[PDB]
Amino acid sequence: KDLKLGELLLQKGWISREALEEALVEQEKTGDLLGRILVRKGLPEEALYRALAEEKGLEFLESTEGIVPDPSAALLLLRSDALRYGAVPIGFQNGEVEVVLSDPRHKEAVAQLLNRPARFYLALPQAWEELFRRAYPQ
Ligand SMILES: Nc1nc2c(ncn2[C@@H]2O[C@@H]3COP(=O)(O)O[C@H]4[C@@H](O)[C@H](n5cnc6c(=O)[nH]c(N)nc65)O[C@@H]4COP(=O)(O)O[C@H]3[C@H]2O)c(=O)[nH]1
């Protein structure tokens, strides 16, 4: 009985009940992702990602600018896999690989593929792409 995205945003005070109902009513007609509807209707994208991070047990990263990606960690995923799964392995801490995700929905698929202890972070789209390109030059 974990909270869903809308319930989490409501509890955090970042959307109103009327805004949530409005987004759910549209989703019932369109099938769009709820967070995408809420951001279109005015929720800050960062508010969405903070809530998605909490929902999935990920640490939200406010910036990727200070990360120096460990080349040893990046070898654990082929570049094509890092891009498709939206996952950048950036280093190691106490025998866990640190991995920055672009989409919380991919956490399980990435964790299965890595098949080793890992610590997962979530970064905003622009921040993630900057990090990916530094870790995986083409
Ligand atoms: N990268 C990304 N991920 C997103 C986004 N929006 C939602 N998600 C994530 O994708 C899953 C599916 O969202 P959905 O298709 O809108 O399907 C959702 C939505 O239809 C719906 N629902 C979500 N929140 C609420 C709520 O507060 N009240 C009610 N009655 N239904 C909700 O339950 C379904 C499952 O919700 P969740 O457990 O929270 O699981 C969510 C959530 O983990 C987005 O914009 N970007």
Numbering used by the authors: 164 to 301
Question: What's in the article?
Answer:
To gain insights into the structural basis for the pH‐dependent ligand recognition, we crystallized both the Q190E and the Q218E single‐site mutant of the PilF GSPII‐B domain in complex with c‐di‐GMP using very similar crystallization conditions at pH 7.0. Due to the high‐quality electron density maps for both mutants, their ligand recognition mode could be discerned in detail. In both the Q190E and the Q218E single point mutants, one phosphodiester‐binding pocket can be found in the mutant configuration and the other one in the WT configuration due to the duplication of the c‐di‐GMP phosphodiester binding motifs. Importantly, the carboxylate groups of the newly introduced glutamate sidechains in either of the two Q/E mutants were found to still point directly towards a non‐bridging oxygen atom of the phosphodiester groups for the carboxamide groups of the native glutamine side chains. The shortest distances between the oxygen atoms of the glutamate carboxylate groups and the phosphodiester groups were found to be 2.6 Å (Q190E) and 2.5 Å (Q218E), respectively, which is well below the sum of the van der Waals radii of the two oxygen atoms. Finally, the lengths of the hydrogen bonds from E190 to the 2′‐OH group of c‐di‐GMP in the Q190E mutant and from E218 to the 2′‐OH group in the Q218E mutant are increased by 0.4 Å if compared to the native sites in both constructs (red numbers). For the Q218E/c‐di‐GMP‐complex and the free Q218E protein, pKa values of 7.1 and 5.9 were determined.
One target protein for c‐di‐GMP is PilF, a hexameric ATPase from the thermophilic bacterium Thermus thermophilus important for pilus formation, cell motility, and DNA uptake from the environment. The N‐terminus of PilF contains three homologous so‐called general secretory pathway II (GSPII) domains, GSPII‐A, ‐B, and ‐C. Our recent structures of GSPII‐B (PilF159‐302) showed that the two nucleotide building blocks of c‐di‐GMP are recognized by the protein in a very similar manner through a duplicated amino acid sequence motif.
